Ligand binder design. Structure first.
Ligand SMILES: [Zn+2]
Ligand SMILES: [Zn+2]
Ligand SMILES: [Zn+2]
Length: 1241
RNA sequence: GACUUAAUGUCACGGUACCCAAUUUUCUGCCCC
């Protein structure tokens, strides 16, 4: 007669679904599948407010299952009271739910046939001989009656909305044999923190089974998908502002910038509110004069930074992280607007009793530990703007994917993903099993599915609520080796090193060897490193969790069952159990001392361990490494264009993120590098479609219909504390082809890691290889690794100027050694250019020649529409590496413009810039970008290409660009073709095929002493005024003379021998003091070339070594005769793809002499024994400028100077009378500026 | 007490949001009426 009230509390996020009805439930698959979940009925008319509840029938079913288990445990008797076998068969209505399950059954000891006068306690709780059945509720005639389990005070008197209690989520069924999810389904996952308690009542009319009912209530463990214990007692305004910002950006034709702006705002949550409050955003280039290219865009008449500040001051009421997240989400949604399968399972009537053998014992095992992540994990989730549980649309893939976080933003590992990973690991360990089939009427007898019906895990959430970091992926176009437009993706990943609590329970008659094998596989003790692949980006190594601190405790459900009900099996109190002494364990629970080691288990030693084999190596980089973090450089206040990539690493010991970010090369970059290497080696790269392709690259790297067999990891930098300045500031500039000066606002900054040839960066990374590869694929992997070793694919960005050039690879000794089984005289040019001109046979005259002359070569350019691709190594085209020596004939000046006070002489004379010679980690070297433009300009004029870096929009005193011939304008796209010089070194939209390495210093005199005068072995250079494009174009009728080249002379001795005249008299603070090196040094730089044609290699080798008595001009101070480098090729190496896998072979002098001769045939072909280049009219003019008179012809010493204006130095070659039409007409001086070595007297 | 459950039968802890993508190509820190 007594009424029992029951309290139901959940310790996991439970699932709830719409209640609908029973008759109308069949019309909705979501409610039909979720009959074991909590229900939800709407209260209002707008489908926004309702009350959740749990039906009493589900709790009754759980109680019946608990009763069956308890009675079976104690040999069919409870407290000395025997029980019958029950009755679960009906036929003639029928129950609304059918069993379709094995019912635990009993043997004997029933008193008699159960009638409605002596019903056993099992019959009392089962409600067999009651007055009410399946007809209707009618009255409370039930001997046992379960009422609805409504919510509690958490509901409150406010009609709680569904959005406040539940959050929709999508779960998959991942195919084991392939790796791609077959189908998905939706559910609503309520939270257990606030709305996890349900209250109900249980009515008993017969007191014969009170003890059994209470014991069953204690024994109930799972309900509605969550572990439970039963006890007896401003987006709208943000969206509008985001669309206003998008419209303002569109008014400036900058819609593509909206994506990067949204991503930057989203990433801004990592930085504090002081970034916007104190204006800590980058200030942009000062020389640009237009402000930052993004943060200074005028939105409705106001700067973007000020607009963001106003938005923060107006919407700070919702915190900082939420504000930035909402703004980024709204901007991304507006940008996207402007631009599988759902299978909810299914719905015999066979009674299947199961009688366990007599005398057997049943025990429950508890495994507790920590799932410490070893790589940045990622648990995917649909877009929050699309979840909206309750308001889902019916029937444009997203390019931005978030991560799974709970209501407190704590990182979460759902028990769904953990259970799926455990299921697949058990499947691998067992060697058999079935793909999970839904809707079956029978329980499959699989070796895995039997074990997974008794294993229960727990939802785990970290104690870390910091925002996740965003990782970027790009799709390189194979044809042009550039970034494909509209191929940007971003994944939010968590930090590396978080610890998630891990709880596992197994209730069986014996602990299986396969489950223990899986546990030892997951555990990371000594040399195991952990292999619990948890997450959703395994192909790039995101989520290799490692079980730690494993503690196994064993119950005893035969004699110590009463303690199990009394303590509720330690459900929800596992965290305390993990870190408590064994002397305080609850009675009936003992530690498991029979847990075998990893080497003692057979399934682990055979099936689980050799599935994934790691390959680890330390990549040595002997050059700057710039990974070009694209959003961090847009947020950090350093005001730099490109910075190196860095990570955030969690530290368990300090329970916080490491204060120093870890520099590394992205695992995505590693994967792309090896994928490109393998694709180009095997020729499968560049194929039209990979929809159903089964090529080698698709086989060993996965496609849309499969999963990759190789998983990569990050390239962490270990050699990081041996530099004392890890990253060096290197800045470049674009030089006009006509004036010869900088292109005004064209400078860009780079901040890469300071890798040095003698102090190289050491990056240590690894990748896992799945078992089952044949010999061919392992050979392909080893070949790709060897290609990476030989420096074919430079790491990072700016690989064409010598950034991230690999110097070697040292594989790990333990395990990669198995795959380790698969892994003449110097060239001389004898061409002597006559170049006699005026200076020759004029020793006693001592004429004066203008320092710079203009090379005119017409307006005829041949553009090739058959652009050579980078998809594959073409057989007929050459590819290899040039190793050449650079020797200086005049003092060379390469200023280290990073620090304008390298000599620290600004104290005495402020405003006087002081640079040093370029050096990385204290050793002198020449930048590869300075050699690139030094050879490109020579090669562009040699092949009569266009003015690639010409600067238009400058007027006279109809713009220089307008005056230039239309054929010589820079090549914009690939539609019209590319110039001969624009096709080797490449332009935008086409990566160049020639890469120039850094020029280290090897031998020769160290510095220029300059005894006396200058203290710090330097030369105080004269004033270097900006070039004036008015002496060459006096009138509008005159056209652009063409390229500008500087004569070769040793006039720097005037600067050196009169140093006291410059720095003391005249030119107070507009000069420059730089360290210089004396003539006679040697520099070794490698020019890697790829897929060059037959004559393109001859032109290159002719450009590097034009012959005797010809040299190039390099470095600052060219008009003064500074930096006349003499490049000689030491050895040419050329490899080729072949079946025999022949290594790199160095071509002899005969091939080089043949290569150059074939290159000469191209030049004469375009115009229309040993070659004589001085026959072509334009080459003859070019080689006169590069002719050096003082190399061997010692008697020559031309006087090369700029004429003074007046009254400065006239000791008649003065600008006072040189532009006057009376003395020298305009048509004459232009002709005098075009012919090299024309004496101006 | 209804808005919410039928009762001699609820493996939904019966299902990883899983697979595909090099942050990147090009640019000499240059220089005279
Ligand atoms: Zn009975
Ligand atoms: Zn099965
Ligand atoms: Zn061109």
């Amino acid at each position: 007669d007594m009424n029992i009230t029951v309290e139901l509390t959940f310790f996991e996020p439970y699932r709830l679904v719409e209640w609908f009805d029973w008759d109308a439930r069949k019309k909705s698959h979501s409610a039909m599948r979720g009959q074991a979940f909590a229900q939800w009925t709407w209260k209002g008319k707008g489908r926004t407010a309702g009350k959740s509840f749990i039906t009493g029938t589900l709790v009754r079913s759980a109680v019946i299952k608990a009763v069956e288990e308890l009675l079976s445990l104690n040999n069919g008797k409870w407290e000395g009271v025997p029980c019958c076998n029950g009755s679960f068969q009906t036929d003639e209505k029928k129950p609304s739910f059918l069993r379709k399950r094995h019912t635990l059954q009993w043997q004997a000891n029933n008193k008699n046939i159960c009638d409605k006068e002596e019903a056993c306690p099992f019959c009392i709780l089962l409600g067999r001989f009651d007055n009410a059945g399946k007809v209707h509720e009618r009255n409370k005639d039930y001997d046992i009656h379960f009422s609805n389990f409504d919510l509690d005070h958490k509901q409150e008197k406010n009609d709680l909305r569904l959005v406040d209690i539940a959050s929709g989520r999508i779960l998959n069924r991942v195919d084991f044999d392939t790796g791609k999810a077959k189908d998905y389904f939706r559910t609503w996952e309520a939270d257990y923190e606030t709305y996890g308690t349900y209250t109900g009542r249980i009515t008993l009319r017969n007191e014969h089974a009170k003890k059994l009912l209470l014991a069953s209530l204690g024994f109930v463990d799972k309900l509605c998908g969550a572990l439970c214990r039963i006890e007896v007692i401003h987006n709208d305004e943000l969206r509008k502002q985001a669309e206003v910002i998008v419209e303002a950006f569109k008014q400036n034709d900058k819609l593509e910038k909206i994506r990067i702006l949204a991503d930057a705002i989203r990433t801004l949550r990592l930085h504090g509110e002081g970034v916007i409050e104190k204006d800590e955003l980058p200030d942009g280039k000062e020389e640009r004069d237009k402000g930052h290219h993004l943060w200074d865009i005028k939105v409705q008449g106001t700067a973007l930074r000020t607009k963001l500040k106003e938005l923060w001051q107006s919407n700070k009421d919702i915190g900082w992280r939420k504000f930035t997240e909402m703004l980024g989400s709204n901007l991304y949604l507006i940008y996207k607007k402007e631009t599988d399968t759902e299978y909810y399972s299914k719905a015999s009537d066979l009674f299947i009793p199961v009688t366990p053998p007599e005398g057997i014992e049943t025990k429950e095992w508890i495994i507790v530990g920590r799932l410490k992540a070893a790589t940045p994990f990622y648990f995917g989730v649909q877009q929050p703007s699309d979840s909206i549980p309750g308001k889902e649309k019916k029937s444009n893939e997203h390019t931005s994917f978030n991560i799974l976080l709970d209501k407190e933003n704590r990182y979460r590992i759902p028990r769904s993903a953990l259970r799926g990973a455990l299921r697949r690991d058990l499947r691998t360990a067992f060697g058999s099993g079935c793909n999970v089939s839904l809707g079956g009427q029978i329980l499959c007898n699989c070796k895995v599915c039997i074990e997974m019906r008794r294993i229960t895990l727990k939802d785990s959430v970290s104690d870390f609520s910091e925002p996740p970091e965003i990782r970027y992926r790009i799709a390189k176009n194979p044809g042009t080796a550039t970034v494909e437009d509209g191929s940007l993706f971003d994944i939010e990943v968590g930090p590396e090193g978080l610890t998630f609590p891990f709880v596992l329970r197994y209730r069986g008659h014996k602990f299986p060897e396969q489950l223990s094998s899986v546990i030892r596989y997951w555990e990371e003790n000594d040399g195991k490193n952990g292999m619990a692949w948890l997450g959703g980006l395994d192909s790039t190594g995101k989520g290799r969790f490692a079980l730690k601190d494993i503690k196994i405790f064993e119950w005893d459900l035969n004699q110590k069952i009463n303690e199990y009900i009394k303590e509720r099996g330690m459900r929800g109190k596992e965290k305390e159990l993990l870190e408590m002494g064994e002397s305080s364990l609850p009675d009936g629970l003992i530690p498991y001392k029979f847990f075998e080691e990893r080497e003692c288990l057979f399934p682990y030693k055979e099936n689980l361990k050799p599935q994934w084999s790691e390959v680890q190596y330390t990549i040595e980089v002997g050059s700057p490494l710039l990974t070009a973090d694209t959003i961090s450089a847009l947020t950090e206040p350093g005001n730099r264009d490109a910075i190196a990539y860095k990570k955030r690493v969690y530290n368990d010991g300090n329970n916080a993120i490491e204060p120093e970010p870890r520099f590394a090369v992205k695992s995505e970059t590693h994967r792309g590098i090896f994928r490109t290497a393998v694709g180009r080696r095997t020729g499968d790269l560049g194929k039209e479609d990979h929809e159903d392709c089964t090529c080698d690259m698709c086989i060993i790297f996965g496609n849309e219909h499969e999963s990759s067999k190789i998983r990569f990891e990050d390239l962490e930098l270990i050699n990081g504390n041996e530099f004392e300045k890890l990253e060096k500031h290197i800045d470049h500039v674009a030089i006009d082809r006509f004036t010869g000066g900088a292109l005004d606002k064209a400078k860009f900054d780079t901040y890469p890691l300071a890798g040095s040839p003698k102090k190289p960066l050491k990056l240590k990374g690894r990748f896992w290889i799945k078992k089952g590869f044949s010999g061919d694929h392992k050979l392909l992997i080893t070949t790709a690794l060897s290609d990476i070793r030989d420096g074919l694919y430079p790491l990072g960005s700016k690989g064409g100027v010598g950034y991230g050039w690999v110097a070697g690879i040292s594989i790990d000794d333990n395990v990669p050694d198995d795959f380790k089984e698969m892994i003449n005289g110097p060239i001389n040019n004898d061409y002597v250019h006559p170049g006699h001109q005026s200076p020759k046979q004029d020793h006693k005259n001592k004429n004066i020649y203008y320092p710079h002359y203009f090379l005119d070569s017409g307006s005829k350019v041949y553009r090739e529409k058959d652009i050579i691709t980078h998809e594959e190594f073409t057989e007929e085209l050459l590819s290899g590496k040039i190793n050449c020596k650079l020797e200086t004939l005049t003092p060379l000046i390469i200023p280290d413009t990073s620090d304008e006070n390298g000599l620290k002489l600004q104290g005495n004379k402020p405003g006087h810039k002081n640079y040093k010679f370029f050096n990385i980690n204290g050793e002198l070297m020449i930048p590869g970008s300075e050699l690139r433009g030094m050879l490109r300009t020579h090669f562009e004029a040699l092949t009569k290409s266009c003015f690639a870096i010409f600067g238009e929009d400058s007027t006279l005193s109809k713009t220089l660009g307008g005056k230039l011939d239309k054929a010589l304008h820079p090549c914009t796209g690939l539609s019209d073709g590319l110039c001969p010089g624009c096709h080797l070194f490449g332009t935008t939209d086409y990566k160049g095929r020639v890469k120039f390495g850094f020029a280290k210093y090897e031998n020769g005199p160290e510095w220029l002493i300059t005894r006396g005068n200058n203290p710090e072995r330097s030369l105080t250079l004269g004033v270097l005024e900006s070039p004036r494009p008015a002496f060459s174009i006096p009138d509008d009728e005159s056209e652009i003379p063409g390229r500008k080249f500087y004569l070769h002379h040793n006039g720097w001795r005037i600067i050196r021998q009169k140093q006291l005249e410059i720095r003391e008299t005249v030119q107070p603070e507009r000069n420059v003091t730089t360290e210089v090196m004396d003539k006679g040094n040697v520099f070794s730089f490698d020019v890697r070339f790829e897929n060059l044609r037959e004559w393109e290699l001859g032109l290159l080798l002719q450009s590097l070594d034009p012959g005797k008595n010809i040299a190039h001009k390099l470095g600052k101070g060219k008009p003064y005769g500074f930096g006349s480098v003499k490049i000689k090729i030491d050895s040419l190496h050329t490899f080729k793809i072949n079946s025999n896998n022949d290594k790199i072979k160095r071509v002899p002098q005969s091939d080089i002499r043949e290569y150059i001769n074939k290159g000469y045939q191209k030049l004469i072909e375009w115009s229309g024994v040993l070659p004589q280049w001085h026959v072509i009219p334009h080459i003859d003019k070019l080689y006169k400028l590069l002719w050096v008179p003082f190399l061997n012809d010692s008697k020559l010493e031309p006087d090369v100077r700029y004429p003074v204006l007046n009254e400065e130095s006239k000791g008649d070659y003065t600008y006072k009378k040189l532009g006057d039409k009376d003395n020298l007409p305009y048509k004459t001086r232009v002709k005098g500026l075009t012919t090299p070595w024309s004496p101006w007297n």
